[PDB]
Structures are given as structure tokens and as C-alpha cells.
Amino acid sequence: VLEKNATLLLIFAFLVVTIGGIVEIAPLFYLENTIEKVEGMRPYTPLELTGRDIYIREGCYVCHSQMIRPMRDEVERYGHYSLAAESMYDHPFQWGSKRTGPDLARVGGRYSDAWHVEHLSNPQSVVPESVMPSYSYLANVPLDSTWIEDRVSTDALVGVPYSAEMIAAATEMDALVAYLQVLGTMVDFS
Amino acid sequence: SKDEYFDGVIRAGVIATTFWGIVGFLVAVIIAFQLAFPALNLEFGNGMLNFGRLRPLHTSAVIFAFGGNALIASAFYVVQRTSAARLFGGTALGWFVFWGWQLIIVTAATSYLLGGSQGKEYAELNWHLDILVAIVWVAYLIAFLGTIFKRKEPHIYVANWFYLSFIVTIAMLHIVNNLAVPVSIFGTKSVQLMAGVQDAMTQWWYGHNAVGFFLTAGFLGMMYYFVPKQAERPVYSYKLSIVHFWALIFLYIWAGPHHLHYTALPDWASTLGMVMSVILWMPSWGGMINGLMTLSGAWDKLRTDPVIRMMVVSIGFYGMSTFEGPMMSIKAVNSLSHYTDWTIGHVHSGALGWNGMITFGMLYFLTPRLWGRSGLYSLKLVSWHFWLATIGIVLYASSMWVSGIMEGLMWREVDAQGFLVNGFADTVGAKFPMNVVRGVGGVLYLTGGLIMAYNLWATVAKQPKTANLAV
Amino acid sequence: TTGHSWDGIEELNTPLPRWWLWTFYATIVWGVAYSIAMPAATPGILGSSTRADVEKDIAKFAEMNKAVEDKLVATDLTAIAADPELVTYTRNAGAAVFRTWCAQCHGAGAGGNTGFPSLLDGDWLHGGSIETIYTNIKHGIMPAHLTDELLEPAQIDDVVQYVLKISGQPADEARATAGQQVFADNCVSCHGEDAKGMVEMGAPNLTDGIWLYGGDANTITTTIQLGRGGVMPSWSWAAAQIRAVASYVHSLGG
Ligand code: HEC
Ligand code: HEC
Ligand code: HEC
Ligand code: HEC
Ligand code: HEC
Ligand SMILES: [Cu+2]
């Protein structure tokens, strides 16, 4: 029965619901492949980290994927298919779910900073047909980097290898471009 | 005493359900239009309308605010009646859940456009909001489970199995996926506990199960109460209820990796997701069968009662999506479907067709009763609403399928020489008509929502003091 | 029907639908089969299957189209532009490759825009020869006179006006004398006298017709003030394809 018993039903539900989570999530913490960074890779530089946060704030993810699937055509279009090691540092992970715009994972030099500036400033200007929104404010706002130290410290706590030295050492458009320029670079050079 | 059901909270949640429905769907239409014509985005100045920011607002408002309020109103009404006792938290605990929830949505409205988002889908709100939601949800479970504990009848209606499960699992999912170290006060001024593949897994476990419990299970509870609520008597299958419920509740949690196909996530996990997503097909359909078969003999009612129409059609879309989902969960299919508008097609088929329609019908049924009214102000409007909503959903789905297939194909398509046939821009251009049609379909559905608002309002006007006697 | 009512609702004790049962069981069976077949096997892939299929996809593709690329590679770039077999397939596909990779900077037309060169036309900054174009593609890609004390606020204006005269004829007498003098001193070294320009440097000729580049006096003032600094990213990492593209770009003008 157990129809009648509130506690039993509750307990069984909690138990029934748990198995998939334990089975899928938990073992990942342990598996090395997903944990290991690409050997060459380093953590995001403070400007790039700030830019990544901007990429998050804006909602770039909502149109842009950062995960190259292992198919020939996407390899051809984007580059080497993404590797788990690349995303090891990413709190939170940027893999997309939608590609209104093209995949961003490996823009490890593909465009010049100047291009990125013009495009972000007005995508239509460079790419007339673009659906992408214009982000001119990025030029307007400067970064104080007050918070950057805190952010890196927190990431270190999270496991990112920032040096004490890195924290100490650390426009929005500049940051965004800086971030975009790093993407996927780690694998190619290593 | 207190023999009378506490209609209070259900009334508030119902009205707010309609309100948030309008707000969320309107944002949906607007952002869709933004995809069609980017001008709708502010060119200079981030401002008020920018797609990247608005999108999660649409998401949260539609799911948590609209769907959430629908769930609150429905669960509070349904559990009370199904168990025959007045709500356990009462105005105090339950109303707290109301205001608290309202605060949560309001905070989302302010915070998201402001730019504070974790970037995690369906997770987007900042940590402070996460704590608030955890608190409100905790209160909500105490009220609900308490209501069950206090029940009169020895057995607990299956609808409550679904609601109860939904409650618990969402709480667990929310807490786990939200672990994050706070860097600053808000926005995503927190970084997620996990990273990379692991973060992706936790995210999609959370993300699927969100629709799985929040959108499917809880709504299945709604279906279980409302569909059988009719003049016609018995036709159902209890044993199915049992099999379908447990199997769904168990199997669904495994479905997470289907999002992750052909990604960095390890092959084993992806496969487990695929296999279980396929097994998931059966229980999910068990829900639809249990709902529809109940109607058997009763079908003549469909022409007569539009509320019934809504519930039935709701199940039709539900089954359709619950079929399409398992298919897309196959790696080969996902190979095409992923990152295309098809995913969106799938989402709105379930969203407009299943969730929205059943909640709609649910409200049309309950709101008069809660309001101390025999029925809605105008049945005709419910019918018109039904049509508007149906054509809108179908149009939305069709456009997205065409767009999605076109995109996956165009992206993958290779020439004789082996070169890539289309530029991404070409695919983008191909998508435009799809964007416009989708904008229209969503617009029509939204208009239907407006008609609902008008009708409900008219009915709401009739009586102050609408205690509806004993009940 | 069962004995207990929940507010109105009662439930029939009915059997699970046979088809429903079958489908449920079938899915389960499929799942077990899938797991045995997948990671835990399937034939056709040695070891264990994985995303490894990628290698196979590329490999078969390579077998299928390796010859076309290999034939082209032996041929010189100039030859690969001329020949409609390789040469024509090189323009359409090279043109195919062009759209995917290059079109976003140099235009679908390859006509270019402000800040990016028009590949179609006759004029080449780095040099039009096949080797030059290839080099541009394979290995990828103006001094700030405003600061150099002498140039200043006025010197820049003068040089701008003079260059517009080299390009054509506007009327500003102060902006001309001074500018001629400055150009001969500094600019001429890279752009030459009479602005033929030097391909080696990628210094464009000042004696040009109306192009997409900011001809206006003001725009010239800005480039002279601040200097240029444009990049053509290297396709050697990202990109055989580079060769076909060189053949296509070459074919474009003529
Ligand atoms: C944006 C980052 C570009 C990418 C993508 C492509 N090109 Fe480019 N190219 C770009 C610029 C800004 C310039 C001018 C650089 C300068 O001197 O200031 C160029 C130049 C070339 C040239 C040389 C033209 C000449 O006058 O000699 C060639 C042959 C060329 N680009 C080819 C080319 C190809 C084939 C591309 C796709 C693989 C491509 N470019 C991409 C900017 C950008
Ligand atoms: C939804 C609409 C968006 C938003 C929210 C973002 N982008 Fe994009 N983006 C979009 C489209 C349709 C395109 C293709 C047309 C074009 O190139 O303009 C792009 C393109 C880019 C690119 C170039 C990618 C490439 O060609 O390799 C980049 C680098 C890019 N977008 C960046 C970017 C950033 C940083 C965003 C947040 C500010 C952003 N995009 C949002 C569509 C959309
Ligand atoms: C040495 C290197 C020099 C010096 C001494 C001068 N120029 Fe400039 N110039 C040079 C290059 C390599 C380029 C191309 C820049 C690029 O493509 O990014 C240029 C460009 C110009 C232009 C722009 C042409 C255009 O609009 O596309 C102008 C107007 C120009 N240079 C003028 C100019 C003047 C007036 C100079 C003396 C003050 C001068 N250059 C010096 C290389 C070099
Ligand atoms: C749950 C209820 C729900 C309702 C009701 C709803 N949506 Fe959405 N919408 C979603 C979800 C979930 C997503 C995110 C999809 C994703 O992330 O793949 C979304 C995303 C979107 C997007 C972004 C599409 C893209 O390609 O990025 C648009 C546009 C949209 N919805 C339009 C609409 C319109 C128009 C309506 C008209 C009624 C509507 N929505 C109603 C749930 C809903
Ligand atoms: C709202 C109703 C709804 C129902 C019912 C539903 N899903 Fe979905 N589906 C969604 C949403 C929302 C997303 C988008 C998630 C995202 O943003 O990536 C989605 C996307 C998917 C995708 C594509 C993921 C990707 O990125 O390629 C698959 C596969 C999927 N769901 C499987 C299923 C399965 C399996 C079921 C049931 C057996 C199911 N769906 C039922 C809402 C629903
Ligand atoms: Cu899912």
C-alpha cells in the first residue's frame, strides 16, 4: 500500500528521485578526464575574467554556444571539438544550448580586436544581416576592478589556480574583447 | 471549526497566475520580435530592451511566475479538496508563500534586466534570491505536506503523489544546482560551485528535472484533479497511475545527459541519459493515456465545454512533446536538433500546448469556485481563447520545426568537394521567416491570454464576500 | 471502480493497456541492448566505440576528398586559379571556403567595407601576385604622427590635405604647402613620393581612386594622427584550404 502512510510515501519519493543524481553527478567529481585542465592552460587573466562576467551579464550565452561537437562539419566550421579539460576553470560553464549566433568556443584569434569592437558596437554595421543586439554601452563603461581580487580569490577557493601574485596584480568593451580572444586558445597552443 | 476551505491564497495565486501569464508571454512575444527585428533591441544604451537580458526574464517569469503561480493555486485548491481539510499553513504559512513568491518574481524582474544572472538556465537568479526561494519553498512544502498529514480520508489521491513529488524534488534540485560562493551582493555575484563538464551535468540534471517535476509532475497533479472533475462519472486506470507515477518519478532524474549529447560530457553519462530518456517515453504516455481514456464516452462534452477542450488538447500536446523528447534524446537525432530552433519548438510545444493549456483549463474551472461563482463570465470567451491558443501553439511549433531542421541541415550540409555548403549567416537568413511566424503565433496565444484576463476580470467583479458557503 | 472518492473523483481499476505495456518493456529491452552495445560491444569499432567516430568521419572524408585537395596542392596557385577543373572548382569551393571563413571581414561579395580590403578589385596593399596573396592568407598581416613632435595638431591637417591632392584635388592652400613638405620628409619613406606605396610594407598607394577607405579629409586626419594597425589573421592554424582560397582570391580579379 503505502498509500495511507505520508512518511513512507515521502521517504520512498526522496529515495526514488535520488538515484539518478547520485549515479550521474557524483562519479564525475571523481573522474579525472573532466577534472584535468589542458596542460598548457592557465586561469583567466583578470581582464579576461572580468570580461567573462560581462559576457555572462549581457546574456551572450543565450545566442552563442561554447561547445564544439565531434562532427566533421562542425569541426570544419568551428575548429577542434571542445574538450572537457578546456572548461575545467569555468564557474559557471558557458557551454551553449542554442546557436542563434555561431559557436564561440574557439575564437582563439579568428578575428581582430578591432573587428570585435566594431561588431559589438553594432553587429549590423559589420554583418548587415545580423540578428545580434548592439552593445555600444560596453564602450561607455569603465572597469574599477575593485571586485576582481575578490572574484579571483573566490575562484581559487573553488580550485582555480590563481597565484596570490595573480590577485594582487589584477572599458567593458576591452574586457569583453579580451575574454573573446582567449576562447579555445588553450588547446591550440598547448 | 475552520471547517471551510481556505480559498484565500488560492484566489490570490490564481489572479496572479493570470497576471504573470500576461507578463511572461508578452515578454515572449517581444523577444521573439527582437529576433525578427533587432531594432526592438536598444541600439545605443543597454537600457530596457536587450535580448540577452530579457530572455531569462521571459524564462523565469513564464516558468516560475506563471507556471509557479499556477502550481500554487492548483495545489492549494486541489489538495484541500482531494483530502477534504482546510490548508495546514493557513493564511499564515500559505499566504507567506504567496507574498514570498511574489517577492521572488519581483526580484527577478528587477534583477535580470539589471544584468545579475548566474547564466545557468532556469537557475539564473542570484544567490540572495536563491536563499529566499529556498525559504519560501520550504514553507510551501510544510503547508502542502501538512495538509496531507491532516487529511480526512485514509488514501491519498495520486494527484498529490505528483504534487508531493514535484515539491520535494524541486527543492532538492534547487538547493544542489544553486550551490555557489558569493563574491558580491548580487546579480551573479556568485560563482558556481562546479565547473566544466561537472557543472554541465549538475546544470542539466537540474534543468531537465525542472521541466520534469515543475512542468510535468506538478502539472500531472493538476491534470489528475481537473480532468476528472466533470459531470460524467468514472473511466480511468488506477494501476496505470501507480506504474506511470513511480516509473516517471524514478526514470526522469536520469534524463539529464540528453541535453549534453556529443559534448565534453563523458560518453557513458550521455548514453545513460539517452537510454533512460527513451524508457521515459512509456511512463510519460501513461499520464496522457490515463488522462484521455478518462474522457471516453464523455467526448460529446468536448464540443459543449471548452474548459474540457483545453484540458484534452493539453494532453494531446503533452503526449506529443513527451514523444518528441525521447526521440531528440537519441544521440543521432540530437546531432541534428541540438542548438537549433527545434529545441525551442520542443519547448513551446510542451510549454504552450501542455503546461499553459492545462493550467488555463484548471484556472477556468477553479476561479469561479474560489470566487464564490457558479461559473466563468462568458463561456464563449473560453472557446475563443481555446482557438487562439491552439492556433498560436501550432503555428509556433510548425515554424520552429521548419527552422530547426533547416538550421541543422544547413549547418551540417557538405558539398561534393567536401566543403561546407552554407555560411552560418545563410542559415540565419533562412530562419527569418520562421522568426516572424513564431512571433505571430506567440502573439496570438498572448492575445488569448488577454481574453482570459478580460473574462476573469469580469467574473471577479461580481461578488465581494465570495466564501462560497461551506466550501 | 474503487470504493474511495476524493471529492467527486473516483477511479476505475483497469488494466494497463497491452500496447502500453509492450512499448514500456520494449524500451527497457532497447536500453539494455544499447548499454551492451555501447560503453559499459558493438562491432565495427575496435576497442570500444566513443566519440571516436569523429576520427572515422574525418578519415572517410579524407579518403573521399583527399585526392581533390592533393591534386590541387601540386599545382601552382596561379595554375589553380586558371583551370576551371581545379581552378573552377577552386573558385566556386575556394569561393565556398571563402564564404564560411573570410566573408565576415571581407564581405560576401569579397568587396570589403571600411576597415577591410576589397579583394575583388585590382588594388593590392601587400601585392597582387599569387605568392603574395597566399602569404597574406597563410601567415596573416602606420605610425601615429599626431604625437611625433613636429607633426602635431597642424602638421597632421596639412599632411591630410596634401594626400587628398595626391589622390585628387581639393582646395586648401595652407593644408597643401605644409603637407607636401611633411610627406616628403616622413610619409614618403613608406608610401613613396607621389604615393605609389610599397607592397613590401603593406603601405597602400596614396594615389588612388575612390575606394571604400575613408577618403575624407577628417578620416585621413585620424589615420595620420593615430595611425593604422589593421590585422589579417593567419589561416595557417585555422585552415590545403589556404591554397584553394589563394587561388580563388587571385581568380577574383580577372
Ligand atoms: C577579419 C579578422 C579578417 C579576416 C577574418 C579575413 N581578413 Fe583578410 N584582411 C583583413 C584586413 C583588415 C586586411 C588589411 C590588412 C592591412 O594591410 O591593413 C586584410 C587583408 C587581406 C589580404 C591582402 C589584401 C592585399 O591588399 O594584399 C588578403 C589576400 C586577405 N586578407 C585574404 C583573406 C582570406 C582569404 C580570408 C579568409 C580565409 C581573410 N582574408 C579573412 C581582415 C580579415
Ligand atoms: C542573440 C540575438 C545574440 C546575442 C544575445 C549575441 N549574439 Fe553574437 N551573434 C548573433 C548572431 C545572429 C551572429 C551572426 C551574425 C554576426 O556575425 O554578427 C553573432 C555573431 C557573433 C560573433 C562572431 C562569431 C563568428 O562569426 O565567429 C561574436 C564574436 C559574437 N556574436 C559575440 C557576442 C557577444 C560578446 C555577445 C554578448 C554581448 C553576443 N554575441 C550576443 C546573435 C547574438
Ligand atoms: C612606415 C611603416 C609608414 C609611415 C612612415 C607612413 N605610413 Fe601610412 N600606412 C602604412 C601602412 C603599412 C598602412 C596600411 C595600414 C593598414 O592597412 O592598417 C598605411 C596606411 C595609411 C593610410 C590609410 C590608407 C587607407 O585609408 O586604407 C593613410 C592615409 C596613410 N597611411 C598616410 C600616411 C601619412 C600621411 C604619412 C606621413 C605622416 C604616413 N602614412 C606614413 C605605413 C606607413
Ligand atoms: C514554460 C512556459 C512558456 C511559455 C508559456 C512561453 N514560453 Fe517562451 N520560452 C520558454 C522556455 C523554457 C524558453 C527557453 C528555451 C531554451 O532555453 O532552449 C523560452 C524561450 C523563448 C524564446 C527564445 C527563442 C530562442 O531561439 O532563443 C522566445 C522567442 C520565446 N520563448 C517566445 C515565446 C512566445 C512568443 C510565447 C507566447 C505565448 C512564449 N514564449 C511562451 C517557456 C515558455
Ligand atoms: C515544458 C514542457 C516539456 C516537456 C513536456 C518535455 N520537455 Fe524536453 N525540453 C523542454 C525545455 C524547456 C527544453 C530546453 C532546455 C534547454 O534550454 O536546453 C527541452 C529540451 C529537450 C531536449 C533537447 C536538449 C538539447 O539541447 O538538445 C531533449 C532531448 C528533451 N528536451 C527531452 C525530453 C524528454 C525525454 C521528455 C519527456 C519524456 C521531454 N523532453 C518533455 C521542456 C519540456
Ligand atoms: Cu531534458
Numbering used by the authors:
A (entry chain o): 9 to 178, 215 to 234
B (entry chain n): 57 to 527
C (entry chain p): 13 to 52, 60 to 160, 174 to 271, 281 to 295
From the paper:
CIII2 is a dimer with each monomer comprised of three subunits: the Rieske FeS (FeS) protein with a [2Fe-2S] cluster, cyt b with hemes bH and bL, and cyt c1 with heme c1 cofactors. The FeS protein external domain (FeS-ED) is mobile between the b (close to heme bL) and c (close to heme c1) positions. In R. capsulatus, both the diffusible cyt c2 and the membrane-anchored cyt cy carry electrons from CIII2 to CIV in respiration. Here we report the cryo-electron microscopic (cryo-EM) structure of this functional bc1-cbb3-type SC (CIII2CIV, at 5.2 Å resolution), together with three structural conformers of native CIII2 (at 3.3–4.2 Å resolution).
Cryo-EM analysis of the tripartite SC preparations (fraction B-1) showed that the initial three-dimensional (3D) classes were mainly of two different sizes (left). The size (~180 Å length) and shape of the smaller particles suggested that these may correspond to a dimeric CIII2 associated with a single CIV. Focused classification and processing of the subclass containing ~62,000 particles with the highest initial resolution and best discernable features yielded a tripartite CIII2CIV map (SC-1A, EMD-22228) at 6.1 Å resolution (“Methods”), while another dataset produced a map (SC-1B, EMD-22230) at 7.2 Å resolution. The [2Fe-2S] clusters of the FeS proteins of CIII2 could be recognized closer to b (heme bL) than to c (heme c1) positions but had lower occupancy and resolution likely due to conformational heterogeneity. The heterogeneity of the FeS-ED of CIII2 in monomer B (away from CIV) was more pronounced than that in monomer A (adjacent to CIV). Superimposition of the CIII2 portions of SC-1A and SC-1B maps showed that CIV was in different orientations in different maps. The two extreme locations of CIV with respect to CIII2 were displaced from each other by a translation of ~3 Å and a rotation of ~37° (SC-1A in red and SC-1B in blue). Other subclasses identified in 3D classifications showed CIV in various orientations between those seen in SC-1A and SC-1B maps. This CIII2CIV interface flexibility is attributed to the limited interaction between the CcoP (N-ter transmembrane helix (TMH)) of CIV and the cyt b (TMH7) of CIII2 (top view). Comparison of the maps SC-2A (bipartite CIII2CIV) with SC-1A (tripartite CIII2CIV) showed that they were similar, with root-mean-square deviation of 1.6 Å.
